[PDB]
Amino acid sequence: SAIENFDAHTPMMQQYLRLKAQHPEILLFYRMGDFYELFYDDAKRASQLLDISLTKRGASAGEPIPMAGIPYHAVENYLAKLVNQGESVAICEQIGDPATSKGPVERKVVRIVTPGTISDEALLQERQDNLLAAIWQDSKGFGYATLDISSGRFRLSEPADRETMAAELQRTNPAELLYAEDFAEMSLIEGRRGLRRRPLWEFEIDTARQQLNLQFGTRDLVGFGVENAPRGLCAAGCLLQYAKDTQRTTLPHIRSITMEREQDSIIMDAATRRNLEITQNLAGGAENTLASVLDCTVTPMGSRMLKRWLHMPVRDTRVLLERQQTIGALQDFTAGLQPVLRQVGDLERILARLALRTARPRDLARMRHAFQQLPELRAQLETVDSAPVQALREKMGEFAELRDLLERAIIDTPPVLVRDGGVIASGYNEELDEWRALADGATDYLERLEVRERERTGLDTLKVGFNAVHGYYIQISRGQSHLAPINYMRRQTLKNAERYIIPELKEYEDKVLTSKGKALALEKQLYEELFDLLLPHLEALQQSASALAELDVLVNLAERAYTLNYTCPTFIDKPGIRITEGRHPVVEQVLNEPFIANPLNLSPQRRMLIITGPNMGGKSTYMRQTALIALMAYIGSYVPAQKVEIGPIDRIFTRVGFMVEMTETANILHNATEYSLVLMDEIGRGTSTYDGLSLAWACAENLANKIKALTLFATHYFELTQLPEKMEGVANVHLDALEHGDTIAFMHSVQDGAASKSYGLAVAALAGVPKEVIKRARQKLRELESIS
Amino acid sequence: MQQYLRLKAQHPEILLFYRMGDFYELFYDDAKRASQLLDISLTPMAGIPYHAVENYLAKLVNQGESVAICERKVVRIVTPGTISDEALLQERQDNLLAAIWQDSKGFGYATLDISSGRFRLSEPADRETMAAELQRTNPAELLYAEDFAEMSLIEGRRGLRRRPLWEFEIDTARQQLNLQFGTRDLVGFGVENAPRGLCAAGCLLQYAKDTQRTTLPHIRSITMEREQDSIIMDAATRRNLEITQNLAGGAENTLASVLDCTVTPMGSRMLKRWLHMPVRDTRVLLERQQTIGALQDFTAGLQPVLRQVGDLERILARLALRTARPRDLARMRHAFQQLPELRAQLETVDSAPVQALREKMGEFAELRDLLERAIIDTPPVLVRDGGVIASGYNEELDEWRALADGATDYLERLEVRERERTGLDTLKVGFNAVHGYYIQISRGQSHLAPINYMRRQTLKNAERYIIPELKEYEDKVLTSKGKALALEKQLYEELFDLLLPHLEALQQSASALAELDVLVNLAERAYTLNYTCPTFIDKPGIRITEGRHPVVEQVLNEPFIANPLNLSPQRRMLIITGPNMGGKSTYMRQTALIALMAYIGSYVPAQKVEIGPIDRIFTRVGTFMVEMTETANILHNATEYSLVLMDEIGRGTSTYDGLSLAWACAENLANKIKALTLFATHYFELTQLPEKMEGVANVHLDALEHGDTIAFMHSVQDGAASKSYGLAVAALAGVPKEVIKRARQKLRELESIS
DNA sequence: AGCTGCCAGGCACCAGTG
DNA sequence: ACTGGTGCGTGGCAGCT
């Protein structure tokens, strides 16, 4: 096993190892001329993941070196295979110039691709956020922080406990999570994609204040509302140190951070988010969710924004009224605005690629195209009487200048890259038209020299061509070549031709090639100059992008209210919900039969409904529809009902039924307040008959009598219908069933009162439990009903 | 590409891989389907590299999709149930074609394994045993009749194939099948009066033959599977016992994972088949028993030799289809070289079955010797390029190779001659398709090329040339090589000629080797893991002393606690109270698996097991609705020979209704049915059942409060449970002191009256 | 239209002339 | 020390069919 000290290595392997040791945990692509290459175990892994050959590399002393690699022009394809598997790559490039370089040319890692810091169009999902998060734990709480690199959205929060932290990880769903080496509660995080253990020094607070002030160009973070917040700042510090280290360029689009407080949003727990199928259904897919229904936005950025609001309802009455207003003002204007807004596309990600300086030609094209829709959007929106719509008309901006620049700079449909030129347009730079001018002897000159030399020699097989390896030539067939001028110089031989070079062609080769390299460089100077001219207006460009996404959202929720018959919610001071004719938004589109609308009435005097009714009677659904109506109302949307009054809701809790059920329930009892909506679905599990019910009863009583929260409480325990009798705030409601003949009818109708009876025997009969057994069950029931 | 849609008329219901360069390209609506099933992208194009077609065909084919290749006209069709290439199968898993069919009377069913020739039919009467047969056999491809009524059974299955009604005609069926097997009638196969099943098998065989476009000389038999030959296990039971597959779709923490230490892939597949089809006939069981005990001693000697034998079943398939590539032959040779050693080790085992497996096994010495002399030690994957046939097998071939080598030797020396005659140290001789051989000088030295050298190609740093002498010897090499390659192929096709007449005996060998793999494994497993030989009794009853869950005991690193079990007709039902937390559930399932293992012929995880005849095994251990429907199936279909295992029915409905259904169920199962039953319940009110009816007793699990925890004991005790622990766990989970207090009052109040 | 085989641009290696 | 040949991934495409 070779001892491999520094001197045992070649100049190349020495250099490769310094850089490898900057990032020992992750794959390193190492630029060698036209190939990106990997070595040692990296090569063996790449070989297994990227389906390429594992080969070797000769060595004057000792062991051979395992090696794999791909040509430079295929990189993006392979990076996609790797980031789709949760893998990071450090990309190493050549900085220097081999000709002014005795040893190996100089080499830096210029970039690291990681699942959380990708900004390229090919490696992302259009309609779905891809966040980088940092997390860390204290002796009292959590610090958490998300950055979305391809928009600059930088956020900070300090969840108070395990279950709020869990709910946050579920909500943000980071593609990559940096977490501190001493994180205690690993069960929040174990089994998460993109997990990245970090050293504790990256979470040091004085360094975080330093990075973030530096970054934001401030002295303190008071203006951002986070000087207050050292737990969170330490995740933000780690997160930004990383973003920086993966990008290794400045990041002008990350110009701010905001704190997400408990009190600004309704905080749904983890069960709640799952039970309501907000963007992922219970089997993991995106069919039959809230979002499948509501989301008909016409730009990717507008669909992501919608999904964030759905997930994070604001509590701010002002903001909510504003959004509701906008939705009603724009009812009519949707069919005109939507086709036009669709042509804005994903402006937000393009400006991100603009700030990272990675934007390609078609990115500037689509940006130019976006600016071209701004006038038509301005004209439509002028007529809409709504101060909120006008603020969003105003934030949208116009950018006449920058539009006119991209029309005079890029051609109508440029190629995918700038590497191959043919991107910058005519008239933009008069030195460039002049450099193409000279490299337009390709048309005229060559055909003329050809026909001239064909006529002159009388050699009819004579052609003129170009070949990358040997340059220009004059071909002559093998059978005519013994007849060519003595002047003609052998350049390249072939099985049945002989190609030649004379001084007039080689002169024309020296000027085509060199004028073409001069013209390409210039084009790249000019194309990177588009960034210098576009970038100073970046602030307003991001505000334009966000304006347009918000518009896309509100216009969408305006169309959805109209189409699916939703009305405006009103807000009240105290806790309570009053629905007239509410429907479950999702279930009312999938069902082929018609949806039975039911009411609800929660107040402080009527703050807990014990809900009976048969299995399949519609109990769960009535509970979910309450939470979704409350949810849509607190994103500012119209709501699926004839009428809705609703008061302030701080937090929604769900428990849907061993230890986990009890623990979940403890948390409901410790953190629920009079402002929470609590959904308990068929809880209280014991080991003997009355064990678990005793527990639900005690729990219910705590919710009614001590916590006084708003509680929908579905049960099959008929014994809990005796709760109202005994408890202030508690009422019985029930889902009507109908036992005509021998079968059962599920009315999905909510009535007031306890049910006339439970229906368990009936459901069993339905499932084909033999008649003879149902007969005896009915006998014992009658026995049990005589105790009381 | 207007000659694409024309070809998708030819075969429309099949994905159409279309040659486009170094790629196969799917277009309109095959491409939609293809980018969703394989994670690759679309533009309506889709694409895959040529180097990975078998790698992308194996995915599509194990999601129930046929694929048609195109190179132009459709040159190849692979279907899921008909593949036999080793790159396209999973090494340790059966892959079946199946046909299904219905009658006024009932169902017909057939299954083929195209690689082993294992052909089987059956005639399930009710639909639930038809469902049962579909989960067990789990075809990769399902042929069903057009005007088939009960689509509910086969609706969600992958690999469905709608078929004309005439493909199920009984007279076509009998006549095909008899033609396939060389018989006038099917009486020697035991299926002549099995028309429902025959129709299914007549379709199946038709399809097989059509997909192959060959003889299938290896399918020479069919067998009826009968209801009474087997312990019937519904899908739900099969799934809850985690036999091959775990409740969470994986292959671990399963019975087959603990017990499957077979050494050959064909022996692993056979074991899994026994594990899903326990037999009622104790004769076959006493025999497997007797064999495992006979071999406990010879196991260490046998398994490394058998491991070497590999997959002789699937190689023989490829021998019968005539597709067996040189390594398939090289590894059949290796298998043969183990038979004499295998025969020596088994010589002394004093059981008549091991000696029958030893005769059946065979030796085939002169076939061993034929391939020792025919093929080289490590031949290439394909015959295509030769270097497979051995030095000294055939006179002509060595002659043609010696002429090639002497032409190729000349040319290595032509290089040293030209280079010593010119003084040009960069001169060499190479070969490619464009030029044949050529002298190559480098660019810097090429201006001193002899004037007799004719230039044919200029590279960037070299020039290449030909001379007459170079082209003359190119002729000698290429004609020789070509003749020796044509001959290699002819010689290799002649191995198929000489091997195939013994195909029957070879299949009997692979089969016998498979069983031996299984029994040698079941025997190592019994010994290693302290199992015991179960005795069988006449009337029903299970009696276990210190028995264990075979899987939980290897997986969980905690002390497994063993438990007794006494069921007879005077003690048919145990009401099981106390905590569950899987303790009850492990206890119940372990009864099922000990019974299951008894009835494949294996040893079992206990110190003693006596067990009576069992016709079915029901295990409702796992909505309220599904629980009632599974329970309803138990009550409609259980007999006094069934083992029934119920987990706490009544949960998820009112106390009284669910107590009422529990009670009534247990009555039924104990009085009417009289099945052997473990009825786990939470209802303490059911513990008054032994007092009211004969045959019922009370067992329970207890638990132990200590330090700052609870200890759920794993131990079954007589009598009803004295305690509940819902509240105890509640306390330990953080539920406020005072909520717990209130709950404790209410509990006393509710139980109080009872 | 297909199939085979040069080439890319780094670096190190290696066998032959100081 | 130089000099001039060698080898090393995958993919693009010239140069033959």
Ligand SMILES: Nc1ncnc2c1ncn2[C@@H]1O[C@H](COP(=O)(O)OP(=O)(O)O)[C@@H](O)[C@H]1O
């Ligand atoms: N109000 C309604 N109108 C029409 N169908 C309904 C309604 N409520 C429920 N359903 C139907 O009944 C089914 C059962 O709903 P669920 O709330 O789960 O019943 P439960 O929870 O009482 O067992 C749902 O899948 C839905 O299709």
Ligand SMILES: [Mg+2]
């Ligand atoms: Mg429910």
